[model samples]
Target: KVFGRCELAAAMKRHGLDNYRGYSLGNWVCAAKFESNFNTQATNRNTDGSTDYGILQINSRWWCNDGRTPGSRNLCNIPCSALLSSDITASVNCAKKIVSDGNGMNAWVAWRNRCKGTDVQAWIRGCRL
Candidate 1:
C-alpha cells in the first residue's frame, strides 16, 4: 500500500511520530518521501549485501534480520518482511528504535541530504497533522 502526502503524515502521527525524540513530523514526512515514497512494500538492496525495507527503510544490517545480511543484528526482533506490512505499526516501531540508535535521524542519508537544515515544515504544509 502506498500513502499520499497528507495520508502518510496522518498515519505516522497516529503512530506517535509527531515530534518523536525531538524530531518534527515534517522530518519524517520528507524522509519518507525520499526513502520509499510512502510505499509500504518498498525495498532497496545495498551493494554491501544489506537491504532497506519499507517506508522508513529499516536496514537488515543492524535493525532487522533477512538471513542475508552478514553480521546481522535483529535489534527489533522482527523479520525484515515485517517492515513491509501495510498496517505500518511495525514500520513505525522500527523507525522509533532507529532514531535512538545513536546516530539519530542521520541514520537515514535521505533525511540528512533532503530534510535536514531545510524549512521542512513545507513537507506537511497542507496536512492537518
Candidate 2:
C-alpha cells in the first residue's frame, strides 16, 4: 500500500487526466492506451510535426505558463511536482472542476466506460475521491 513519490506522481498524472474535476485514473489509462498508451513523457508528431504532449496528451503550452513547473500553477496541471500534491486530492479536485461537479462522478463514469467496470460501488470501494 506504500507508494513512492514517483509512483504516486505517475498515478496522479495518469488518472482520468484532465487537470480538473470528474476525471479518473481508469479513464486516463484507457484513453491514453488508445490515444497515446500511458505515455506521460510521450510526445506525438502532427502532420506538420508539431508535438502533442504528456500521458493525457496535454500540451501545457496552451494553458498557463506556470503549469510546466511542479507546484507552481495557481491550479493543478501535468508535470506534477510530488505524489501527495500530484496523486491524491488536488488532481481529483481539479478533475471534478473540469466536469463541473464537486464529486468527479462524470469522470468516473467516463473512465468506467473506457475501462469497462461497474460504477458507484467501485468508486466507493476503490478510489480516494
Candidate 3:
C-alpha cells in the first residue's frame, strides 16, 4: 500500500488499531519521520554490506535467510514489506507473530509505553490482564 497520512489513518481504523503500538499517531509519526520519513521501503546499512529494510527497518539480510547464509527462501516466509505496508492490521499482526515466536515483545511494549497505555503498563508491572 502507498504510504500517506490518510492511508495510514484509514489503515489504523480498518484494523481497529490503537496508536499505542509505535506510540501514539503523533509519536509514531515522529519516530517514522526521524527514522525514515515514514518511508515504507526505506533501507539502512551496517559497516558491512548487510542491510535493514522496510518501516520497522527489519534486518532483511538476517531474516531473509537461514543458517546465516542468503538464498534461503524458506526464511523469507514473512514478507518484510508487509510489516511496513499501509495496512495497519497487517503490519501489527506480522510484528506480533514475530514477537510471539520465541522472542519477546519489548518493542511493542515500549511503543505502548510511549503511547501512555495504562493497561499495557499494568500488565508489564505484573497486574492481571
Candidate 4:
C-alpha cells in the first residue's frame, strides 16, 4: 500500500483495527513500520529460506502460501500476494486470526524485537485520531 504513517493509521482505524484483538493502534503501527515501512508490496527472504510478505511481513512458513514456498501452512486461506495489495482488509483479517491464536502482535518478530516496550506513539503522531 505504501502508506504514510498517518494514512496507515487511518486505514487501520477504518478496518476496525484501532483496538482489534486487544492490541493498541500504536502497536500495530509500530510493527508495520519496522516490518515493511508501510509498503504493501514488501517482501523479505528469511535466512531459513522462507519468505515474509506484505506490510506486516507475514511469514510464508506459517501464514499464507506464496506458491513458490514449499511447506506453507496457508493457515489464513489466502494467497500471500493478497497481502501485497493496497486494500488491506484481507491482510488485516489474517492478522486478526494470528492474534486470536495467542500470538497477538508477537506473531511479528518486528513487534517483539522493536515495538515492544517502546514508545510506539511516534508511529501515530499527528494523525489526530
Among the numbered candidates, top lDDT falls to 1
> What's the C-alpha lDDT at position 91 in model 4?
82
Put down candidate 4 lDDT per residue, 3-115, tens digits, no spaces.
Answer: 99988898898898878887889999998999999999999999877789888888888889887777668899888889999899988888888888876778888899998
Q: Native-vs-model 4 lDDT?
A: 0.87
The estimated TM-scores of all candidates read 0.96, 0.36, 0.47, 0.92
Q: Candidate 3 lDDT, tens digit per residue, 29-112? A: 333434445567676664555555454455545454223334433244565555465544544454434444564434333343
Q: Which one wins on TM-score?
A: 1
lDDT for residue 110 in candidate 1, whole number 0-100: 93
User: For residues 31-128, what per-residue lDDT tens digits would candidate 1 score against the true structure?
Assistant: 99999999989999998999999998989998898999988799999999999988899989889998987888999999999899999999899877
TM-score of 3: 0.47
Candidate 3 backbone collisions, by pair: none
Q: Could you give the candidate ranking by lDDT, starting with the highest?
A: 1, 4, 3, 2
TM-score of 2: 0.36
Better structure of 3 and 4 per lDDT: 4
Candidate 4 lDDT score at position 52: 90
Clashes of each: 0, 14, 0, 1
Q: What value of lDDT does candidate 1 attain over all alpha carbons? A: 0.92
| Model 1: residues with Cα > 4 Å off, grouped in runs | none
Candidate RMSDs in order: 0.9, 8.6, 8.3, 1.3
Weakest lDDT window of 10 consecutive positions for candidate 1? 120-129
